[PDB]
Amino acid sequence: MNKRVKIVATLGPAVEIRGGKKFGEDGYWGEKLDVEASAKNIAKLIEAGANTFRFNFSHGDHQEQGERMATVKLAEKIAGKKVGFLLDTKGPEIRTELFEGEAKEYSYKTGEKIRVATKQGIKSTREVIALNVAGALDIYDDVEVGRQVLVDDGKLGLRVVAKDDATREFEVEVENDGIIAKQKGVNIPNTKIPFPALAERDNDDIRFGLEQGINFIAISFVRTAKDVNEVRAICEETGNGHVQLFAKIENQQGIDNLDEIIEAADGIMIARGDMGIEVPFEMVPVYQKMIIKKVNAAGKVVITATNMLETMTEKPRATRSEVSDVFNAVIDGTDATMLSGESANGKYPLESVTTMATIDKNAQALLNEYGRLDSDSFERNSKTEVMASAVKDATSSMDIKLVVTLTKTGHTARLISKYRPNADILALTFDELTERGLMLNWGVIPMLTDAPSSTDDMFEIAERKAVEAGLVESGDDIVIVAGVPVGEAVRTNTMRIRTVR
Amino acid sequence: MNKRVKIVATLGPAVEIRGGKKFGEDGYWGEKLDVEASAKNIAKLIEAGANTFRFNFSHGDHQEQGERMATVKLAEKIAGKKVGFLLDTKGPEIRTELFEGEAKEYSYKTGEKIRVATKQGIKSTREVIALNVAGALDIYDDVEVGRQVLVDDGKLGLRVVAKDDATREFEVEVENDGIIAKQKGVNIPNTKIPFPALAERDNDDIRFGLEQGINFIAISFVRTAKDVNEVRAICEETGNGHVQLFAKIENQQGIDNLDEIIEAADGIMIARGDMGIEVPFEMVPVYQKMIIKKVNAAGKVVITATNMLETMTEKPRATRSEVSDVFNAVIDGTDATMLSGESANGKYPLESVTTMATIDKNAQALLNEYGRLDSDSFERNSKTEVMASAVKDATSSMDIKLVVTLTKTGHTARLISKYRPNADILALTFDELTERGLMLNWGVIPMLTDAPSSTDDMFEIAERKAVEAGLVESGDDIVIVAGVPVGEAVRTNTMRIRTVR
Amino acid sequence: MNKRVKIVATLGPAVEIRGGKKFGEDGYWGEKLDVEASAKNIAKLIEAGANTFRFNFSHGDHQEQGERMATVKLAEKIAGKKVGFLLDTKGPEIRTELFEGEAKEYSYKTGEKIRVATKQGIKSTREVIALNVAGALDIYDDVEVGRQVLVDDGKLGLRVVAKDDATREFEVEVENDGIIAKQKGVNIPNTKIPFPALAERDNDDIRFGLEQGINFIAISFVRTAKDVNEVRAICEETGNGHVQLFAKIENQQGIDNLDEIIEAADGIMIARGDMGIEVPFEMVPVYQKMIIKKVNAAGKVVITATNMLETMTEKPRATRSEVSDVFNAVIDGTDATMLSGESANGKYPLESVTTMATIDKNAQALLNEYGRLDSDSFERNSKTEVMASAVKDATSSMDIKLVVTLTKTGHTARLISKYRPNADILALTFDELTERGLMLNWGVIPMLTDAPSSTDDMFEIAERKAVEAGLVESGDDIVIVAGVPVGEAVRTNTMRIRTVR
Amino acid sequence: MNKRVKIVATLGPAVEIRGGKKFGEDGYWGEKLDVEASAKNIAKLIEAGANTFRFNFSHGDHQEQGERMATVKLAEKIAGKKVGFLLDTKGPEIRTELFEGEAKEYSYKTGEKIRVATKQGIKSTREVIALNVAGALDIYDDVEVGRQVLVDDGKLGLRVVAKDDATREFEVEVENDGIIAKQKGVNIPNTKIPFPALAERDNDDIRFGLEQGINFIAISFVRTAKDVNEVRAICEETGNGHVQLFAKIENQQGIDNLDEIIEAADGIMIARGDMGIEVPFEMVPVYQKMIIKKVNAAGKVVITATNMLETMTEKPRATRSEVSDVFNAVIDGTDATMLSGESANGKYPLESVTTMATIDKNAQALLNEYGRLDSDSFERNSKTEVMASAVKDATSSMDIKLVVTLTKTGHTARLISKYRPNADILALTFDELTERGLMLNWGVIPMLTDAPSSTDDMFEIAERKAVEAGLVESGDDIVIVAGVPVGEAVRTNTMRIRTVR
Ligand SMILES: O=P(O)(O)OC[C@H]1O[C@](O)(COP(=O)(O)O)[C@@H](O)[C@@H]1O
Ligand SMILES: O=P(O)(O)OC[C@H]1O[C@](O)(COP(=O)(O)O)[C@@H](O)[C@@H]1O
Ligand SMILES: [Mg+2]
Ligand SMILES: [Mg+2]
Ligand SMILES: [Mg+2]
Ligand SMILES: [Mg+2]
């Protein structure tokens, strides 16, 4: 079993060593980053099956993101395996501020009376939590007495009992025991804060990440196709048209506009953290199944995100509900499953990726029996898609160890992946940007190779690259597709069934 | 809209008021039990959708259990609604003992060296953990070095590093941070402790339970049909033949013998806490889907259990993986979903029941689209089952608000329930024991009524009881089944499609 | 096996004895009809499974039709079984005339030069065949040199080589050996003769048949819904609204207008004789399958007609192609199969009905495996149809010997028949016109009984009538439907599964 | 549009010109055979769609058969198209003998008393019918009084009223009007004549046939696999191992042993004439549908035979039941439809082939909608069959005009044919024997070409041969399969989707 379901792992301090100390150790924050020791930890997550690392720009600053991206470039070399680089934007969001004196968080008890500030550009204290509102908007008049302020995926609730005009502070009662840490997501349900089109901060974050070299952007709180097209414009103007945009669906407007968002984007991230606060929590499983189906029908990538192995933040074993969630995301048809705090923030980042890889690998064996996606229903809209349908058929008719596609742009590999064959897909492509671009497609193992010449045997190349990567051995049956011959073929036009020598 | 998926709520101190104090408040345990304030609390759980309470005999003593059962009996009169009474057995298991000087539990850090004792009838120290082993078995010779000892559904791991012959103690390294409380599960995977057929303790607990008045027994660690038959023999012997037995499947032996266990039992509880430590965690979802399908095909009851809303033990809102888990259990075909520590041991027992109820109600609306069960594949093996298939056909042909069955024993209601009609099922029955015994069947609303005479119009009765229960109004279409006429019919033989006037 | 597929048998001289002589014997035509001896022959066709007799008004005169109808009324009394009375109209057709000197036919050889007259109201001779054109139309100018004149379902072809203006005769070459008999169908393909709306002759024929007492009219060459509504108007004005209209589809205009014709009519007769000459012969099997499907979807009656056992006109055994045709008409979903010359004109009328009954009975056993009709696809458009769906389901779930419906108008019996249950359908109705009206519905055995009173047990009546008709015995399982109670029920609202005592 | 369903046409005097005279013209038999005029006639049958001619060795002598086979060989050069040569064996059967004084046949009326003789090597009189019994068996002791003797596929019945010991004759009553000709079938249902394993006569006929050059043998009255293996042994012994054996199923024993016969044979001829006298006539359609399904699942050829256009023996147009029969045989899944007396013995042999071809072409357009065969259910049991499944998938995904297979032995063409793709199949093969042997496979157009070298581009070759045959034009999409490269490939291993330039 190669793992066909892709893992997005969020990076953060959990994997980072600072002056020989690990996250949680006394004096950790007084040290600087040990890049090699950090890259060694990250190389172990790559080996365990992380296919793409997520850099959440709601956390840290550019320097911290930039160094973390450099640490992954080193980790790839140590692992001898490449991964995707995914930037996750702030979007039209509210975050808790940094605290005075670089305290990182405080703990609160049910019934404490604290304040939430609206004034922009200040720091929090334990008693007066300051907000970073996208567009530096003033939200004091948008939030009435009786509104709930939710901190960190709704873990901690603050009930607005009064408003203090002298300070423009919400007077709040802590509804339940919990923590307020710096740069935490804030939700105020049933309010209609007028966030701008694309915040200056998002424009700067995106341009910085594009300069560092990324493959993917996940756009937070996509409301309409315009939100995706604003980011697309920046990618194309900076010479970064190869970068793929995943719309994060995490509010009613995103659900209402799903069809236009899917057409504009390269994929969807089902951002269930915010989604289950911005829409009825009991509706998230309905939307999850429907989004995965539509995205797969469009030949695009879907990521299922948030709380997948939440307990593994503190404990070496997931709950029964967490394992059920990962398993059922695979059965629903997801291309990729995501870790957030499990990998970024937790005591068991490596064990989290391992555990997720084990569940994903066991669930992929039940797709023939239980799988929700139905490739038989698709219209085959092009001759490459006809070929992808024929490859699925061959992998259904007999035991195929591997499908190999020689793909210039990844088009053939994406269409084979869409049909969910009962085989791994080796995608041989001829440039690194295409190779990294395929790292979140179901079943696709991207591999860089030289562009075939008109004298090359592409079928010999396919078998040799598969053997040299240890994916197949003598006697295995593989399906190879290619455009034959090189420099005459318009598209993938040939399928070969080949016994490996 | 009526909740078709049934809720088993485990009762515990979480819902109990002690001289004005709630569970988790200073000096809670000092106070006498406020029976009436406790019954008012339990009454809210009934109103929120708890269909059966679970009395877990692994905790407390006969006095405590018997008191709790009496308090539920008052809660029913407050709520104006009856519930099922389910006894959950200790079973062939290992618990932690009570601690010296009524200390409730202790906390341990990774690398800590402590001891686990095999001598029976002793109480635990922080530094030496006593075991209450079923059958007071000496297990010291059963447990090799390098074996794993897990406490509290596997939360805390203890590696056996050495064995002390002179005290017959395990010298154990704490693997991970966690808590050792009183009367918690201990799992030693891949050991073969020869636990008795039925332990004296279980025999005593079942007999006390039967004396108090119960509807269900959930038998822990059912290994073979013999485990079910020993308990069935006590039910019959004491005149409690109406008591239904759910086999808890929570190890490989239970899985291997599942078919003969389903045949001996009235139902299966999928006990996923133990199951996911005793077998590979990533297989539990495979077994959950297969058990629900098999139990439904047998016309019996399936309960999905453990960790369903786990985070709500400590937080007012569940994680996205927990909502996914509850939803997917309903889609899989579960008759019932269960709360353990969420209702027994948590800060949010009412909100846990409400949340589960909300998810279960939403999931039931997607069983047409997504439902795994397939009633079309069933053999109809009796004339009542043919009537059940016809009822299901009527609810597929047109919009039926309610199915009404006049059922002496519940057999017709159980068959209609097996077919999962697109409608609520009102089961009009003539005794309280039959009424309570239907409370875990999917979609069944048990209601007590006078046995109709051969003078009575049972179709008028059905409509009148459905209107009086506020399940239907003028213009609603209903399907009524009955054995016509009373004193001649030997079974349900008539189906009526009626418009409520 | 009761035969569920209905047989329409065409009556003619084959069954008629004249002064002790049988059809074909010397001096036969010099005798008058022996009514009792003729009614005895016809009683044997009823016993063999003829459900409806067809009186083809293209043949004979009113007196001959009237006496044949009287002979069947006697045959019913002798057989002790009722049959339907079906009148088949001339329609907008061309027929060969009577011959001079009551010669009935002549024989011709390939290459003979004869004439066809256009002058209306004259008799034929061997050398000059006169036409009876509906509306007494003059067709001399509508038929050019090179047209084909086809006699008798296209058995004999006449090529128009010249036109003689002095006599207004077509000069024809006999294309193949064959016969021209009196009152034979004539087709001239690729001509557009302007037949009127409803010929005076058809108006008189219909009114005569309505006076004699008929159940059905098959309207020849239905072109549009107007053709059906013209006949409907006459039925309603004469107090004969109970008479059912079957549109004969036998030309392109009928195929083009099929949907409006089905909505206007009570059923379709697939008149393949003319159809296979008026449209491409290879298209008739396509249209047959499509018409049966649409008519069944409309809850109406379909008859498959012509050449079904053609060889049995002269021989005691059908060809392999004939048996295949009857079998496949049943598999396609036909309510009824028809005999024409086999019963009207042949040496083996009784053996023809027997042979057809044997094929139909063997094919009805393969409907579950091979049957084309798909009741699962129907929308259930009324509560009686919901009940019909539920009856189908019961007959699919277990072995049901009989479905009994107490039906005032036949509505419940038609809807049960539409769903094609795996059981015979006993339709108990309370007037003879309804009883005869159901004789061509698939599976329906109509039986006359007294209208139940409010003190009657309709379920006891259903079982008693079924037992007394020898359809069921002690131990058989039957499904009874009724509107319960009499004088309150709006519709069939009750289904009972009953073991016969 | 190309005819996918293949036509077997039985040759006979009907197509033979004798010194200027056609069959059925006065003094036909006086004249010498006009070989060249006969070959011109047979050439028209080839052009009209005859794919194989059947030489029925129950008629004539080696001289007659050998001459006819030579005349077909000239017809091929005239038509410019090859056909298959099928020998149909006499088999373990009873024929009528030749009559005294070269009288061709006699006519008999019902109630006529005549005799049937058991003495072998004598010629028939009108009043005493000699039998040519296979093995020259004496059957007098095999045939009881009240047994039925049927002549000419059961047209004429003869009741055995008494047995004459002194002449060993049956005294027989004519049951029905009909004809006793020379060398006609005699069936005595429910007798057990111990016919040899393989008769000397069959051994001689097969050996003569093989010496002339044939592609197929149809073995009459195959009872067991042993009947097939005796003939296979002669084919192998004489170096004729390429000859394909169709078992004729025409009695209950053949039906009972069908599975072992399909396994021994290359195909089944459903010989319905005999079958519908030897088993109940109404079962033939049940057996026809089941045989076609089984033979197709085995990847072998099925021929549906007898009475398909029977009326066209005497009339230029077929009945509606005959067109229904041909159409339904195609829908059932038949590879081939057959003409017997229609082509051999009739007035309209060319028109019979044309008519069958027209119906077969129309029916093939409805196999998507109505087709009984289901290729989705098949096990794909080899890599060539996986390629066949993939080809079928491509023709379902997009509009493919043609499938082209470069096939050494026809194995790839036979598998593609088994899958019934929505396309014609051009089979490019390198020898005439393989070419002719594919002529009865559904959809296969065999074409002879040079064996490609490892220098050649087989995909260019495929396109060029398809264009040269006028099967495709510029812009048409085609699927080509081949073993790439020649001299390395051990099987068809490549599929190409190509647009014709
Ligand atoms: O078959 P489709 O969907 O029209 O795609 C054809 C396009 O795909 C491509 O072959 C690219 O495919 P690959 O990147 O997989 O090689 C283009 O060259 C071609 O224009
Ligand atoms: O259920 P539907 O299709 O509305 O039909 C209802 C009608 O059918 C009838 O019950 C007649 O049915 P029967 O003739 O079968 O008794 C009418 O009384 C009633 O108005
Ligand atoms: Mg979010
Ligand atoms: Mg347990
Ligand atoms: Mg007609
Ligand atoms: Mg034969």
UniProtKB/TrEMBL annotation, chains A, B, C, D:
Coiled coil: none annotated. GO terms for cellular component: cytoplasm; cytosol. Mg(2+) binds at E250, D274. Residues 387-497 form the Pyruvate kinase C-terminal domain. Its EC number is 2.7.1.40. Belongs to the pyruvate kinase family. This is Pyruvate kinase. It comes from Streptococcus pneumoniae (strain ATCC BAA-255 / R6).
